[PDB]
Design a protein around this ligand. Sequence first.
Ligand code: FMN
Ligand code: CL
Ligand code: CL
Ligand code: MG
Ligand code: MG
Ligand code: MG
Length: 206
Amino acid sequence: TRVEVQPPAQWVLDLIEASPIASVVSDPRLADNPLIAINQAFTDLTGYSEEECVGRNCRFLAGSGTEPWLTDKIRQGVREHKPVLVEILNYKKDGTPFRNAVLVAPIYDDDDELLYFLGSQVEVDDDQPNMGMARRERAAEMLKTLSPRQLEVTTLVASGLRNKEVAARLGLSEKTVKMHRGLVMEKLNLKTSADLVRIAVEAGIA
Ligand SMILES: Cc1cc2nc3c(=O)[nH]c(=O)nc-3n(C[C@H](O)[C@H](O)[C@H](O)COP(=O)(O)O)c2cc1C
Ligand SMILES: [Cl-]
Ligand SMILES: [Cl-]
Ligand SMILES: [Mg+2]
Ligand SMILES: [Mg+2]
Ligand SMILES: [Mg+2]
């Protein structure tokens, strides 16, 4: 099955379009928390077009060998509004199995009002199946270059707090939080918020 989805708003596109990583957004108020947008990298990773994905829950990538003890951790993150990174067996449109390092994280619309989920998928090769640990090592090194306030804002954003919540936690304005976020993105060459949440969760700071 599949539901018809409203074209994505600009903030949805801003979350994923410039990520070099397969990135998606879902809307949990729609039937079966379906995908409402995918980037180009997601089509290149999986072979599915945007028309084939949007309106469906992302578990269409699952197949015979997919680990329910790992997908349950995603289910838990979605229910608790917390980020989860697991490495699960998935299947491309042509039936090619691949190990998917998938991040599912809470994210907010550009008014900091309603909750959505972002998804970030990286292929782990059968060749180099410990690639996950190499991405963790890189992430940890990058985050150690951040100033203390930048690290604090990064941690709380990646933990799933909206900017208004980060602002309340640190005694700042939303504007000041958005400024610190932008400087982290510029310093670490991160294209989108999905890319920022991913290095935070890879490192284990969220
Ligand atoms: C934004 C987002 C991205 C997701 N990406 C994937 C993915 O790449 N592969 C996949 O198998 N599951 C993915 N999922 C997980 C499924 O949608 C689902 O949450 C998970 O399998 C647990 O739910 P279930 O027990 O009903 O399957 C994603 C979920 C969301 C919300
Ligand atoms: Cl879901
Ligand atoms: Cl301030
Ligand atoms: Mg596109
Ligand atoms: Mg299941
Ligand atoms: Mg709005």
